[PDB]
Every structure is written in structure tokens, then in C-alpha cells.
């Protein structure tokens, strides 16, 4: 737990969820309480990474998969370059990309494809922040899914 905190009451405790609630408010639990919060009882959760590399013999390398709209998606081969590949492995913390591959030679695609024509200056933080055609509507074939490798 991060040391820096604002002393504020713990509203609820002992939250128990069924299978597949849309939101926490569907999970039954104990009644609301305004009790003072001990530092240990506060919860910090770290969701998984937004982007992940799949089907690569090395764990760090593979096809580029992005969690968008609740589902994992890939990136098309259009206008893909080495400088674009710098951003993706900057997220992972891996070393700079040694080479970029295209036309799904690395593996056949999966999931609904989200991004296309990705245009990254090379110093941008995230591909989501990068300017590119968003929210699908890319109609790229799954044989056009992209993949890269980067230094460990």
C-alpha cells in the first residue's frame, strides 16, 4: 500500500461477489459503515496491463494485443514501422525494438481488431494517446495482424 494517503472513512467491508456482476453494486455485502479506517485495511488493486504480447517464443515479444471495449484486440499491418514499435515496448519496459514484422507472419490473428494506420512520433507514452484510426472500422484481414520483438 502506498504510504501517502488521506485519512477517510472505510465505507464498506467484506464484499462478496457472485459470478458475472456488471458492477460492484450487484454484489451483496455488509451494511454501510462510517467507521475510521486503519491504514492496513485499505485496499490497493493493480489491474493487468492494457497491452500484452502473445504467441511469442520469448515472453516479451509477440503479436501486439490491446484490451479495448472489454475484449483483446490486435493492430493492423497498415503503415507499421520500427518507430511505431518503440512505443509498444516502452510500455512493457523491454528494451528498444530490434525489428518489426508484418502480415501476421508471427501468428494468425485473434479477437476483434481495433487499431489501424497507427501514427506514433516515437516519444508518445501510449498507443491510445497516439493518433490513429480508433474504435475499429479498420476492416483489416486477420492475416494483416501485426507483431514485433524487443530486447529483454
Amino acid at each position: 500500500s502506498l504510504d501517502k494517503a488521506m485519512s477517510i472513512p472505510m465505507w464498506v467491508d467484506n464484499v462478496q461477489c457472485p459470478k458475472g456482476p456488471d458492477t460492484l453494486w450487484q454484489c451483496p455485502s455488509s451494511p454501510w459503515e462510517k467507521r475510521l479506517a486503519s491504514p492496513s485495511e485499505e485496499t490497493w488493486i493493480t489491474c493487468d496491463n492494457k497491452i500484452r504480447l502473445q504467441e511469442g517464443p520469448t515472453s516479451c515479444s509477440g503479436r501486439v494485443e490491446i484490451w479495448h471495449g472489454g475484449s483483446w484486440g490486435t493492430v493492423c499491418d497498415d503503415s507499421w514501422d520500427l518507430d511505431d514499435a518503440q512505443v509498444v515496448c516502452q510500455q512493457l519496459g523491454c528494451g528498444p525494438a530490434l525489428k518489426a514484422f508484418k502480415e501476421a507472419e508471427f501468428g494468425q490473428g485473434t479477437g476483434p481488431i481495433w487499431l489501424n494506420e497507427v501514427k506514433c512520433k516515437g516519444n508518445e507514452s501510449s498507443l491510445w494517446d497516439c493518433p490513429a484510426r480508433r474504435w475499429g472500422h479498420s476492416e483489416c484481414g486477420h492475416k494483416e495482424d501485426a507483431a514485433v520483438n524487443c530486447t529483454d
Binding site: 497498415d78 502480415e103 484481414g141 492475416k143
Partner: protein, 167 residues
């Protein structure tokens, strides 16, 4: 006494020997997918046109964009076939590619011309260059009619008339 079936045209190239590949089937002209395409796959098409051998193969619709429906997809060819029809194909109308990715060839007989004097690759007052088999060369000064000068200017488009410069 038959006009035979199917024709092979090279469009948008500036010459008969270089152009985006278009194949005639039925009453429509269609393009070839760029996937599984290489210079070995381009030897047959350059031979059937009579131009000769291929020096490059272009993909990703760099040469141009084709509007016609794709006739053949995923061609693997030995490179010694008389016509593209003997090369292996997935099947007629098996369009899995798209107009975003298109295939073209550059044969050997395609030629181009330009004048370059200095600090400017295109300048209509300078030495003449010819382009054969991907190489740049000039023509001899000896035995050139003034009419030949005129056609040079007309081809590039500097003026209706030109005069030989000995210097």
C-alpha cells in the same frame, strides 16, 4: 483464327513493358494480389508480354490502386511457365486480398528519359539520360538530326522546339 482467351495488360506505368498487372477474364479486367508474389512469379508475366526478364516486383499497391475485382489470389509459380495460367493458384474468384494491397511488375525492356544538368534532376536544359534495365546512360552526340532534337523536347515537354547545344 481465334483471338484467344484472356489478355494481360500493364497499366499506369508509362510504357507497355512496365505497369500494374491486370488480367482479362470474361468481360472484366482484374488485378492480382501482392501476397506470395516475387520476381520469380514475375518472370512469366514479363515473358508473355515479350519484354523479357523482370528486374523488380512491387507490392502493397505501390504502383497503383486497382478497382477491378481480384481474379487470382495466392499464386506460386515456378518461373518457367509459358503463361500465368500454368502457375499454381488457389482458384478462380478466390478473392481474399483487397485493393489496398496490389501487385505490379517491372520488366527489363521498359525505358525512360530525362535531362539533368546540375543541382536539379529534372531540368529541360541539360544532358540527356536513358533508362535501360535499371541503369542510367546517355546517347552519343554523333549523327543526330535536328528533328531528333525536336522529338526529345516534345517527349519531356520543355518546348515544341529545341536546338542542339554542343557545349
Amino acid at each position: 483464327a481465334c483471338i484467344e482467351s484472356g489478355q494481360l495488360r500493364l497499366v499506369n506505368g508509362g510504357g507497355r513493358c512496365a505497369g500494374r498487372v491486370e488480367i482479362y477474364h470474361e468481360g472484366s479486367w482484374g488485378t492480382i494480389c501482392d501476397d506470395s508474389w516475387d520476381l520469380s512469379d514475375a518472370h512469366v508475366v514479363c515473358r508473355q508480354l515479350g519484354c523479357g526478364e523482370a528486374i523488380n516486383a512491387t507490392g502493397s499497391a505501390h504502383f497503383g490502386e486497382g478497382t477491378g475485382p481480384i481474379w487470382l489470389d495466392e499464386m506460386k509459380c515456378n518461373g518457367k511457365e509459358s503463361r500465368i495460367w500454368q502457375c499454381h493458384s488457389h482458384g478462380w474468384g478466390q478473392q481474399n486480398c483487397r485493393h489496398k494491397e496490389d501487385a505490379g511488375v517491372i520488366c527489363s525492356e521498359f525505358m525512360s528519359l530525362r535531362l539533368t544538368s546540375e543541382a536539379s534532376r529534372e531540368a529541360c536544359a541539360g544532358r540527356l539520360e536513358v533508362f535501360y534495365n535499371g541503369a542510367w546512360g546517355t546517347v552519343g552526340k554523333s549523327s543526330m538530326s535536328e528533328t531528333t532534337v525536336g522529338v526529345v523536347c516534345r517527349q519531356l515537354g520543355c518546348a515544341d522546339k529545341g536546338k542542339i547545344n554542343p557545349a
